């Protein structure tokens, strides 16, 4: 068990205890970083699936030295592919999230250097899964990634993909979509 399959990138897993906090509160926790398939699986097998974590929690897998925030240099000019999961079962939820992680670490996208990370929001009622990219103006990259996502998760009309710029996402209570699939 000495040898492990190397990944192209180093990834970091993040846990968000609470989605609402005061301006000085840091509810975002680094859990660990990994460089190999085996290390990822080892991490995965020891943490709770998103169907079992607290409501108002987040899971986030981002490349090393990129925070799960849009204020970060890697995310500032970028955006995200959003998938809304209304009335989705737990096994389907866990499977979608895992398949997303596998897309990331497995480098399933041609524009790999456009991928920043991904995050799942568990809110009980309606959960969400998002894939963050570096540049919202990079139409080719965004579209390619979106199509790959659509195929890799076998999405139909029922669940639409929405590409939203992080700058346009600043609403207290809908958000404009640059691209739709």
């Amino acid at each position: 068990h000495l040898y492990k399959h190397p990944l192209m990138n180093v990834w970091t897993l993040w846990y968000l205890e609470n989605d609402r906090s005061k301006s000085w509160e840091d509810m975002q926790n680094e859990i660990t970083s990994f460089d190999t398939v085996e290390d990822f699986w080892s991490l995965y097998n020891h943490i709770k699936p998103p169907s079992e974590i607290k409501l108002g929690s987040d899971y986030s897998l981002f490349k090393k030295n990129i925070r799960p925030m849009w204020e970060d240099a890697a995310n500032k000019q970028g955006g995200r592919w959003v998938i809304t999961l209304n009335k989705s079962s737990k096994t389907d939820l866990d499977n979608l999230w895992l398949d997303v992680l596998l897309c990331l670490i497995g480098e399933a996208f041609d524009h790999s250097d456009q991928i920043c990370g991904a995050v799942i929001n568990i809110r009980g009622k309606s959960n969400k899964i998002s894939i963050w990219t570096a540049d919202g103006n990079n139409e080719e990259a965004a579209l390619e990634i979106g199509h790959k996502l659509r195929d890799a998760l076998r999405l139909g009309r029922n669940n639409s993909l929405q590409y939203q710029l992080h700058k346009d996402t600043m609403v207290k209570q809908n958000v404009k979509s640059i691209y739709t699939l």
Binding site: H5, I31, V37, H46, I47, C103, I105
Partner: protein, 37 residues
Amino acid sequence: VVSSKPVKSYTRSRLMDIRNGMIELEGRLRRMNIWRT
């Protein structure tokens, strides 16, 4: 194009296969009530 980071890809199927043929982190996983066996 040739660069310092050559492409290393893994299909979902491959990754799952690798999963099948198989620190102090436990403490922090337990502290966050995230730990699971």
